[PDB]
Scaffold this active site. Structure first.
Site, PDB file in Angstrom:
ATOM      1  N   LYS A  53       0.852  -1.150   0.046  1.00  0.00           N
ATOM      2  CA  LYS A  53      -0.068   0.024   0.058  1.00  0.00           C
ATOM      3  C   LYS A  53       0.759   1.435  -0.219  1.00  0.00           C
ATOM      4  CE  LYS A  53      -3.099  -1.204  -0.375  1.00  0.00           C
ATOM      5  NZ  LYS A  53      -3.402  -2.166  -1.948  1.00  0.00           N
ATOM      6  N   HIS A 108       7.210  -7.343  -2.200  1.00  0.00           N
ATOM      7  CA  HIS A 108       6.784  -6.813  -1.223  1.00  0.00           C
ATOM      8  C   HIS A 108       7.807  -7.337  -0.083  1.00  0.00           C
ATOM      9  CE1 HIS A 108       3.465  -4.194  -2.323  1.00  0.00           C
ATOM     10  NE2 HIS A 108       2.751  -5.196  -2.550  1.00  0.00           N
ATOM     11  N   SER A 138      -4.746   3.065   4.241  1.00  0.00           N
ATOM     12  CA  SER A 138      -4.951   2.228   2.754  1.00  0.00           C
ATOM     13  C   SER A 138      -5.254   0.723   2.901  1.00  0.00           C
ATOM     14  CB  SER A 138      -3.751   2.502   1.973  1.00  0.00           C
ATOM     15  OG  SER A 138      -3.880   1.901   0.582  1.00  0.00           O
TER      16      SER A 138
HETATM   17  N1  A3P Z   1      -1.304   6.892  -9.901  1.00  0.00           N
HETATM   18  C1  A3P Z   1      -1.604   7.083  -8.470  1.00  0.00           C
HETATM   19  N2  A3P Z   1      -1.585   8.238  -7.822  1.00  0.00           N
HETATM   20  C2  A3P Z   1      -1.869   8.350  -6.423  1.00  0.00           C
HETATM   21  N3  A3P Z   1      -2.160   7.406  -5.737  1.00  0.00           N
HETATM   22  C3  A3P Z   1      -2.137   6.019  -6.377  1.00  0.00           C
HETATM   23  C4  A3P Z   1      -1.684   5.993  -7.695  1.00  0.00           C
HETATM   24  N4  A3P Z   1      -1.897   4.695  -8.063  1.00  0.00           N
HETATM   25  C5  A3P Z   1      -1.969   4.038  -6.897  1.00  0.00           C
HETATM   26  N5  A3P Z   1      -2.164   5.058  -5.806  1.00  0.00           N
HETATM   27  C6  A3P Z   1      -2.575   4.669  -4.353  1.00  0.00           C
HETATM   28  O1  A3P Z   1      -1.574   3.779  -4.053  1.00  0.00           O
HETATM   29  C7  A3P Z   1      -2.361   2.850  -2.962  1.00  0.00           C
HETATM   30  C8  A3P Z   1      -2.111   1.283  -3.413  1.00  0.00           C
HETATM   31  O2  A3P Z   1      -0.679   1.046  -2.961  1.00  0.00           O
HETATM   32  P1  A3P Z   1      -0.037  -0.256  -3.542  1.00  0.00           P
HETATM   33  O3  A3P Z   1      -0.344  -0.429  -4.952  1.00  0.00           O
HETATM   34  O4  A3P Z   1       1.326  -0.469  -3.269  1.00  0.00           O
HETATM   35  O5  A3P Z   1      -1.034  -1.380  -2.983  1.00  0.00           O
HETATM   36  C9  A3P Z   1      -3.463   3.302  -2.891  1.00  0.00           C
HETATM   37  O6  A3P Z   1      -3.712   4.646  -1.830  1.00  0.00           O
HETATM   38  P2  A3P Z   1      -5.083   4.882  -0.966  1.00  0.00           P
HETATM   39  O7  A3P Z   1      -5.782   3.546  -0.451  1.00  0.00           O
HETATM   40  O8  A3P Z   1      -4.726   5.595   0.133  1.00  0.00           O
HETATM   41  O9  A3P Z   1      -5.976   5.518  -2.003  1.00  0.00           O
HETATM   42  C10 A3P Z   1      -3.968   3.909  -4.190  1.00  0.00           C
HETATM   43  O10 A3P Z   1      -4.876   4.768  -4.550  1.00  0.00           O
HETATM   44  C1  PLO Z   2      -1.253 -15.643  -9.641  1.00  0.00           C
HETATM   45  C2  PLO Z   2      -2.367 -14.765 -10.121  1.00  0.00           C
HETATM   46  O1  PLO Z   2      -3.376 -15.244 -10.597  1.00  0.00           O
HETATM   47  C3  PLO Z   2      -1.995 -13.533 -10.119  1.00  0.00           C
HETATM   48  C4  PLO Z   2      -3.012 -12.551 -11.094  1.00  0.00           C
HETATM   49  C5  PLO Z   2      -3.689 -11.269 -10.215  1.00  0.00           C
HETATM   50  C6  PLO Z   2      -2.366 -11.176  -9.203  1.00  0.00           C
HETATM   51  C7  PLO Z   2      -2.613 -10.066  -7.903  1.00  0.00           C
HETATM   52  C8  PLO Z   2      -2.886  -8.633  -8.389  1.00  0.00           C
HETATM   53  C9  PLO Z   2      -2.538  -7.431  -7.283  1.00  0.00           C
HETATM   54  C10 PLO Z   2      -1.623  -7.854  -6.121  1.00  0.00           C
HETATM   55  C11 PLO Z   2      -1.602  -6.595  -5.212  1.00  0.00           C
HETATM   56  C12 PLO Z   2       0.081  -6.681  -4.554  1.00  0.00           C
HETATM   57  O2  PLO Z   2       0.364  -5.664  -3.645  1.00  0.00           O
HETATM   58  C13 PLO Z   2       0.204  -8.104  -3.956  1.00  0.00           C
HETATM   59  C14 PLO Z   2      -0.120  -9.326  -4.694  1.00  0.00           C
HETATM   60  C15 PLO Z   2      -1.379  -9.258  -5.675  1.00  0.00           C
HETATM   61  C16 PLO Z   2      -2.520  -9.687  -4.743  1.00  0.00           C
HETATM   62  C17 PLO Z   2      -1.484 -10.397  -6.917  1.00  0.00           C
HETATM   63  C18 PLO Z   2      -1.096 -11.702  -6.439  1.00  0.00           C
HETATM   64  C19 PLO Z   2      -0.955 -12.787  -7.506  1.00  0.00           C
HETATM   65  C20 PLO Z   2      -2.161 -12.569  -8.580  1.00  0.00           C
HETATM   66  C21 PLO Z   2      -3.236 -13.471  -7.876  1.00  0.00           C
END
Ligand code: A3P
Ligand code: PLO
Ligand code: NA
Length: 294
Positions: A53, A108, A138
């Site tokens: 996040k 991650h 988030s």
């Molecule tokens: N282009 C962008 N500009 C600003 N925030 C962005 C973005 N793309 C993703 N995010 C924000 O990044 C977070 C997701 O993080 P990650 O990709 O690491 O999982 C979310 O925060 P929020 O939940 O605060 O909206 C999402 O809206």
């Molecule tokens: C293995 C597979 O089908 C892929 C297609 C969509 C993918 C997911 C799409 C987006 C995310 C968000 C990321 O922060 C963690 C893994 C995760 C949760 C991926 C895990 C692997 C997945 C489930």
């Protein structure tokens, strides 16, 4: 139908790998171990590393655009998780055929578990950090709609779990403190969600320099235009609306929730904010100053 079946079987629980919590179903001892111990790290590989996040999606889209020099075609037609596969997931980038020249991957994993062969490689890493308070918020909302994650519980109970590292991928503090130990290496870049929010074009230029991929005023402006929150929220391939409802409940919420800095002030009570600062102050004792430190 392979991913659809898996998504419907997600328990919303955790398991541990070397003391760190991982969501059951989308990760396994085998998948994590593979990413940790693989020898397949290449000189031109590019890795995006973050604590969940922190804006991973953002950075991923930015680089996909940079690689195609501003042309949106690839991000418009290919799903984001395929353009920059995850290292540790069951179906990782290490368990898939070479489909892209310069490989772009995401992770991650905290530094003590990330691909060990990396330390002696020339591969590039972009580590991105975000205000941990906004990260908590988030992650709180995302958990309610994320199939692999267990329900957060109360804002207050979830905050205690976060501070103790009782969440996926462990402690935010340990995560960022460990990875900043790479500061100084020329194949490592530390950048923040806050910086991209303050000056997106500027950040994009820094990432271009770091990657050795200069761009004309045109391609640059394009990368910027398509990287914006509004543009990405509207891109079916990047906003995650194609995932099975059981994996991500589209009906109840969106992955790209708000996209701003500071939403924490609307979720933390003053008492929770004060307790958080005590935890932060103790854990980040000798750390340098970050944009989110007011
Ligand atoms: N282009 C962008 N500009 C600003 N925030 C962005 C973005 N793309 C993703 N995010 C924000 O990044 C977070 C997701 O993080 P990650 O990709 O690491 O999982 C979310 O925060 P929020 O939940 O605060 O909206 C999402 O809206
Ligand atoms: C293995 C597979 O089908 C892929 C297609 C969509 C993918 C997911 C799409 C987006 C995310 C968000 C990321 O922060 C963690 C893994 C995760 C949760 C991926 C895990 C692997 C997945 C489930
Ligand atoms: Na969930």
């Amino acid at each position: 139908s392979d991913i659809s079946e898996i998504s419907q079987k997600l328990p919303g629980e955790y398991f541990r790998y070397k003391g760190v919590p991982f969501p059951v179903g989308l990760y396994s001892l085998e998948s994590i171990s593979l990413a940790e111990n693989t020898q397949d790290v290449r000189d031109d590989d590019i890795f995006i590393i973050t604590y969940p996040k922190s804006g991973t999606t953002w950075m991923i889209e930015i680089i996909c655009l940079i690689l195609k020099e501003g042309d949106p075609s690839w991000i418009r037609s290919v799903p984001i998780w395929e353009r920059a596969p995850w290292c540790e997931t069951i179906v990782g980038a290490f368990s898939l055929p070479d489909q892209y020249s310069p490989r772009l991957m995401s992770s991650h994993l905290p530094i003590q578990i990330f691909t060990k062969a990396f330390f002696s490689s020339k591969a590039k890493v972009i580590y991105m950090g975000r205000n941990p308070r906004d990260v908590v918020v988030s992650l709180y909302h995302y958990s309610k709609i994320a199939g692999q994650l267990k329900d957060p519980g109360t804002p207050d109970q979830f905050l205690r779990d976060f501070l103790k590292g009782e969440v996926q991928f462990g402690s935010w503090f340990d995560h960022i403190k460990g990875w900043l130990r790479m500061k100084g290496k020329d194949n490592f870049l530390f950048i923040t969600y806050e910086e991209l929010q303050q000056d997106l074009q500027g950040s994009v230029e820094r990432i271009c320099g770091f990657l050795g991929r200069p761009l004309g005023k045109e391609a640059l402006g394009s990368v910027v235009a398509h990287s914006t929150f509004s543009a990405m929220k509207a891109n079916t391939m990047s906003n995650y609306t194609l995932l099975p409802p059981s994996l991500l409940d589209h009906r109840r919420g969106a992955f790209l929730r708000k996209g701003v800095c500071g939403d924490w002030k609307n979720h933390f009570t003053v008492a929770q904010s004060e307790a958080f600062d005590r935890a932060y102050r103790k854990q980040m004792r000798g750390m340098p100053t970050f944009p989110w430190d007011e």
